[PDB]
Design a protein around this ligand. Structure first.
Ligand SMILES: CC(=O)SCCNC(=O)CCNC(=O)[C@H](O)C(C)(C)COP(=O)(O)OP(=O)(O)OC[C@H]1O[C@@H](n2cnc3c(N)ncnc32)[C@H](O)[C@@H]1OP(=O)(O)O
Ligand SMILES: CC(C)(COP(=O)(O)OP(=O)(O)OC[C@H]1O[C@@H](n2cnc3c(N)ncnc32)[C@H](O)[C@@H]1OP(=O)(O)O)[C@@H](O)C(=O)NCCC(=O)NCCS
Lengths: 392, 391
């Protein structure tokens, strides 16, 4: 239409563990640092400045306290960035950070803006899941509510049972998530996409020691063995998922700089990717988190593509069974799926992850000189986001 | 790909705090207006709620009943199809208006052919500030050093900037009630309002079992210049009072958008399109003077001047905000908030942006005029602006 949106830059913090390396930052400082970082990554040779950005849209799930009151705006102001830039924070639960990209591209397509930033934040050390309601969570839905929507841990089990996924099957998968994340770090695959973040050091009681680190490494990786995974106790009684086959609670932020193509060309910025097809669809409430099956089918239809066409898949690892369910339906080549590991090993700062995945997918297309990626996430409320991006 | 147009729009009546709508769960109030806007298009055409691809709803205080993506929860709660995706957005005061911008963007991009933009705020049930704990200092970094006042101090700073007196705002506040009463007396709001079934409560805020169909805005009341003159200012030394500031309210609104050619193929008539949209940052020192910038931005983008615009809806958070904007842009004030505004009709924050688009469109249609401008100030020092054009 009146714009042609392309990604020119994308960057993410390292992902910290709960009460870990980034836990001493205010949620607004963490997001602000990455917003600033993605602008800075355009370089002096771009002539682009933060005040050339027209709008920022960031995903965030638990919009309480530090994360309330439009954190995307608060962060941007806290990082010292120019006040005339508009900002909006979005919640479609887990997919927020991905839908933030979809929305920015849409405003560029519409000719409403020429330059945008899509981002996501979750400082789960600071603002934990469920802070955005009081203790009796029955109160948050109307008395008339009668949809079998399970909690996410029961959802993963129901999905495993529906697909015949076993304890062994998920352990094998969790192991390979850690292995591939450790490969990626060993080989320096994440070195382009990461913006190291200054954070204060907190001790085991969460108290400042005085020192600050520039944090540049994902915290969630660790020595993992099948035997080790075999010993872990399941989160639910009779469940198959354990800590080692579920995403980690994490702190992180990620941001993607978008422009209309002719504005990228003016700044001499290579257009790196565009969206082929995007969606956000509802899933079956009973299974809750099997939605990647539907968002994948919806983007493949819109793109006129099949799963064979896609070079790289990033499908969030909220639980092993979610990915394995998806794969038994859509039948990918698993060597193409989460090639640098996923949330089991890397962490899942919920509102960040959808921008983080777009960042990770793009850079791996670039590293391997390939063309197409598919990004897909399950999300609370029984939803799912899907993107296919193509390198330009 | 797409050419976004408004095909239907509707709003609930606006209840006062602990008033006519206060017994609805926030998810039921939004869900009712989602359903209503579908039914308005479904009756005349082949369209069904499952033809909607995505819903985007604004909401400001995303806590408790309003947490966990209320747009989605409301859609399921109303019994609408589960395959429709939904997202809730917060740019504070402008959330409802930005939800419309974003739905239009997704259509332009060809991501969706049909969507709903909406907004909700159930302020009786989830009050401002519920999305943070008691110590508000905690919600900003210790490094924060921007002079961003609270909204009440902001209204005064703006009054001072513009030479706006206690008298001037009271004159405005009066006209806002008079205009809203004229609109109600003439039935101007009859087309836009979906009446909403709401539980009746007893003295102690407990349901009786009675339900009533609510169709009237609750905030209207008999107002005089003498009466406004005896009201106490909210701040010491301030000019604004309860009679010159928006009323805390409950309400929802929803707007159905389609790609124009798809709308026609469905047998629906496109009613308006967006000429220019923006969401801009404002001066933090004044906080709420942003409608001056958002108005300038959409005009520049549209290649228009203020005198091109037939009807303006600018949100009356505080009288000074509107008077300040009018002193900068010099509209004909007979075209501004012609059916009243939030002083009289109330300001369910996350709803209002969709509610003003609804009100504006319907007043373009009622007068057979072409262009409207909708502009809001917003917490965090932001402002949303839209110019729409009747088709
Ligand atoms: C940026 C934005 O978009 S704004 C965002 C959201 N807005 C806000 O910040 C909050 C909006 N306003 C408020 O917080 C509150 O409504 C206030 C502080 C302005 C006033 O609230 P209240 O005082 O509870 O409303 P209320 O109607 O009771 O007014 C107070 C008194 O003035 C009187 N009053 C108000 N309007 C009138 C009138 N037109 N005629 C006669 N009396 C009136 C009332 O009788 C009431 O009596 P009391 O004070 O003796 O009890
Ligand atoms: C799954 C979950 C409950 C686990 O929480 P947790 O118990 O705090 O996890 P911890 O980090 O404390 O690890 C628990 C134990 O498992 C063991 N463990 C976990 N991963 C391991 C690995 N890769 N190798 C070896 N041992 C491992 C550890 O030994 C640890 O105990 P230890 O440190 O004393 O040895 C938590 O991560 C969570 O709730 N995740 C969210 C679920 C989700 O996916 N959400 C969906 C969003 S779409």
């Amino acid at each position: 239409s009146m714009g042609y949106p392309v990604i020119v830059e994308a960057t993410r913090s390292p992902i910290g563990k709960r009460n870990g390396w980034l836990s001493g930052l205010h949620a607004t400082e963490l997001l602000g640092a990455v917003q600033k970082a993605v602008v800075d990554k355009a370089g002096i040779q771009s002539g682009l400045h933060a005040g050339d950005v027209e709008q920022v849209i960031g995903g965030c799930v638990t919009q309480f306290g530090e994360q309330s009151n439009n954190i995307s705006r608060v962060a941007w102001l806290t990082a010292g960035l120019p006040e005339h830039v508009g900002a909006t924070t979005v919640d479609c639960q887990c997919g927020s950070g991905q839908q933030a990209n979809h929305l920015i591209a849409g405003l560029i397509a519409a000719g409403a803006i020429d330059v945008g930033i899509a981002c996501g934040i979750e400082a789960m050390s600071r603002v934990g899941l469920g802070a955005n309601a009081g203790p009796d969570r029955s109160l948050i839905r109307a008395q008339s509510w009668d949809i079998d929507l399970p909690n996410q841990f029961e959802a993963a089990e129901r999905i495993a049972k529906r697909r015949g996924i076993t304890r062994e099957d998920v352990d094998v998968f969790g192991l390979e998530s850690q292995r591939r994340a450790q490969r990626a770090w060993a080989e320096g695959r994440f070195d382009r996409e990461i913006s190291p973040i200054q954070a204060p050091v907190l001790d085991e009681q969460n108290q400042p020691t005085g020192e600050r680190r520039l944090v540049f490494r994902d915290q969630g990786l660790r020595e993992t063995t099948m035997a080790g995974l075999g010993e872990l106790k399941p989160v639910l009684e009779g469940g198959i998922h354990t800590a080692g086959t579920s995403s980690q609670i994490s702190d992180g932020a990620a941001a993607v700089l978008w422009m209309d193509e002719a504005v990228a060309r003016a700044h001499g910025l290579t257009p790196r990717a565009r969206i082929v097809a995007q969606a956000l669809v509802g899933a079956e409430p009973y299974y809750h988190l099997d939605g990647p099956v539907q968002s994948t089918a919806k983007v493949l239809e819109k793109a006129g593509m099949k799963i064979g066409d896609i070079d790289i898949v990033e499908i969030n690892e909220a639980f092993a069974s979610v990915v394995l369910s998806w794969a038994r339906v859509h039948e990918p080549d698993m060597d193409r799926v989460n090639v640098n590991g996923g949330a089991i090993a890397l962490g899942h700062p919920v509102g960040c992850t959808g921008s983080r995945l777009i960042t990770t997918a793009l850079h791996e297309l670039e590293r391997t000189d390939q063309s197409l990626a598919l990004i897909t996430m399950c999300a609370g409320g029984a939803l799912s986001t899907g993107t296919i991006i193509e390198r330009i």
